[PDB]
């Protein structure tokens, strides 16, 4: 209420916010700031300069929208200040100056980004303490291990993050700029090619819903493309809110296949199965056995049914013949980063790892590199 530490997971698509000790975040809302394009009021209200999250999304027509987290990295601090102000005051209903605040960062977040993050928390929000955790590392902690390789796929970015004895191996971290909203856009494209139209805003936002509900990863893609026409079970129907009923067939598994075949959307990059292998082969040969046996999947874009079994297959094909391979896909893995942050911040050991106001006042923003790694 007035003492408990805060955990704020800042994502490209969604902000996950709550209290350390809780098993789930209190608040999950779009990482969006909207400013009125014109002067006016909502009936019975004074003039608003900004909306954040759900209200910014639902009123986007009269606003200019900003997505200040691009491919995991914060790129607009004015917008981000208003997302954080909304997180504390509107969503959690707390005073930031009363609560230690654990933030999350993308793997290989630039040092300047890290420092500005620490500066804002202390100078703009007056937090008594703060920490910055790599999102992939928290996910591994939440899975109940300190060694393994994490595949974190969200809305903006996918990462392979090998972790040993509790700490990331930065020289072996892979970044693929293919994730949730790329898959949504591809589905919108190929559903359009099937002979549908998503024109009105009401009809363009539902393509994400179809993706989250009806898409899956084929164990054998080539096989399921030939079986497509033949199959009695593939084709599914989705009802629009207006009444229209559209049919989705091979598009269900062609959409997330993009993860394994980035070429589908014109990227010359390698698939998430190849990046996972390449990440392990950049590590010491001494630990690879433990990495191969602890593939932990994280973020909303790993939620597709069958992705676990498909990873198992594609990595066994690439790895040494007799290597013991295990893919862990926690049912909670769309919030595993936040949940891992809740556990870390609840440990007695972590209480001396906080950057305190005193420490920041003596050392300045560069302290973050000394304390947060």
């Amino acid at each position: 209420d007035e003492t408990t530490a805060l955990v704020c997971d800042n994502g490209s698509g969604l902000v996950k916010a709550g209290f350390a000790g809780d098993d789930a975040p209190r608040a999950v809302f779009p990482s969006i700031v909207g400013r009125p394009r014109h002067q006016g009021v909502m009936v019975g209200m004074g003039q608003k300069d900004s909306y954040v999250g759900d209200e910014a999304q639902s009123k986007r027509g009269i606003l200019t929208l900003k997505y200040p987290i691009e491919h995991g990295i914060i790129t607009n601090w004015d917008d981000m200040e208003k997302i954080w102000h909304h997180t504390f005051y509107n969503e959690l209903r707390v005073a930031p100056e009363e609560h230690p605040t654990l933030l999350t960062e993308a793997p290989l977040n630039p040092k300047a980004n890290r420092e500005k993050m620490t500066q804002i928390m202390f100078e703009t929000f007056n937090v008594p303490a703060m920490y910055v955790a790599i999102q992939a590392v928290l996910s591994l902690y939440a899975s109940g291990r300190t060694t393994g390789i994490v595949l974190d796929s969200g809305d903006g970015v996918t990462h392979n993050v090998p972790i040993y004895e509790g700490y990331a191996l930065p020289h072996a971290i892979m970044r693929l700029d293919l994730a949730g909203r790329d898959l949504t856009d591809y589905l919108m494209k190929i559903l359009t090619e099937r002979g549908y139209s998503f024109v009105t805003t009401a009809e363009r936002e539902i393509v994400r819903d179809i993706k989250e509900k009806l898409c899956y990863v084929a164990l054998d893609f080539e096989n399921e493309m030939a079986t497509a026409a033949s199959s009695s079970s593939l084709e599914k129907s989705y009802e629009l809110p207006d009444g229209q009923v559209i049919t989705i067939g091979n598009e269900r598994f062609r959409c997330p296949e993009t993860l394994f075949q980035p070429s589908f959307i014109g990227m010359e990059s390698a698939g998430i199965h190849e990046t996972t292998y390449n990440s392990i082969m950049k590590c010491d040969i001494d630990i690879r056995k433990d990495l191969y046996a602890n593939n932990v999947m994280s973020g909303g874009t790993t939620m597709y049914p069958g992705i676990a079994d498909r990873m198992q297959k594609e990595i066994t094909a690439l790895a040494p013949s007799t290597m013991k391979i295990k893919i862990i896909a926690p049912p909670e893995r769309k919030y595993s980063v936040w949940i891992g942050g809740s556990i870390l911040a609840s440990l007695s050991t972590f209480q001396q790892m906080w950057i305190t106001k005193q420490e920041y006042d003596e050392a300045g923003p560069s302290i973050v590199h000394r304390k947060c790694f």
Partner: protein, 260 residues
């Protein structure tokens, strides 16, 4: 000062994305220093935004807005959109009428009136309120009658007798018959002048119904009205349009009045 109340049938993204329909709607709005747009079917305010972009291309303060949340007892929901020229009038205060308990089944309006207090330095009346109502056709008698209580509410909150009540009241033909008018206090009370008469035609269709109305209470506001200025604006006649293109805009004409 020119004021209008315009029901634009299914005013949404489809109608505003249509460059022709947008042209005629914008031309109609541009006639008025204050205009109430009813039947705004705009989930994410995209149509309202695209209309304001069009209106404010050259000067960003040509029109300011007062817009409501989507109103309705069921899934079918409309907003009230006030567009005004801020160089002609100012908005001093706004509120949504408290029509009672929706969950109880006692709420008096399907679409609770939006209420705006205006500052008008250019007219005889300096301060006046506009109450917006698009009535449920099959509840027209009760809802128009309930506007009497909204007037008393405006009086209580702002100590203001100078109130304009306007919009698609559905105040003629099958929805309000001759005998039901004696049940409507807004008509039976001499406090209210009905500037749009029963004889007026406010339908773009071939029907003859005074559905859309402008009603004024208070000495100052009444004395500000230019005699004979209150009339429907037949946009089919004025823009030399076909009946088909006219209906594509709306099945209602605007009702306008001039103040001085």
């Amino acid at each position: 000062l020119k004021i209008a109340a315009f029901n634009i049938r299914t005013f949404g993204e489809t109608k505003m994305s249509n460059a022709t329909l947008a042209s005629y709607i914008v031309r109609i709005v541009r006639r008025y220093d204050i205009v109430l747009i009813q039947e705004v079917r705009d989930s994410h305010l995209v149509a309202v935004g695209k209309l304001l972009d069009y209106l404010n291309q050259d000067d960003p303060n040509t029109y300011h807005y007062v817009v409501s949340e989507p109103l309705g007892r069921n899934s079918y929901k409309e907003r009230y959109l006030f567009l005004f020229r801020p160089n002609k009038v100012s908005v001093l205060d706004t509120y949504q009428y408290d029509d009672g308990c929706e969950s109880c089944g006692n709420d008096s309006f399907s679409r609770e009136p939006a209420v705006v207090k205006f500052s008008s330095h250019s007219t005889k009346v300096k301060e006046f309120a506009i109450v917006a109502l698009h009535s449920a056709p099959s509840d027209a008698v009760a809802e128009i009658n309930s506007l009497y209580d909204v007037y008393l509410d405006v009086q209580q909150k702002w100590h203001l007798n100078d109130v304009m009540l306007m919009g698609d009241f559905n105040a003629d033909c099958s929805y309000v018959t001759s005998s039901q008018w004696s049940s409507i206090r807004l008509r039976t009370s001499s406090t209210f002048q009905w500037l749009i008469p029963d004889s007026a035609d406010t339908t773009a269709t071939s029907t003859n119904c005074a559905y859309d109305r402008i009603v004024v209470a208070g000495s100052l506001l009444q004395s500000s009205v230019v005699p004979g200025s209150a009339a429907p604006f037949d946009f089919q006649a004025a823009y030399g349009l076909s009946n088909e293109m006219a209906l594509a805009i709306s099945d209602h004409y605007p009702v306008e009045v001039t103040l001085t």
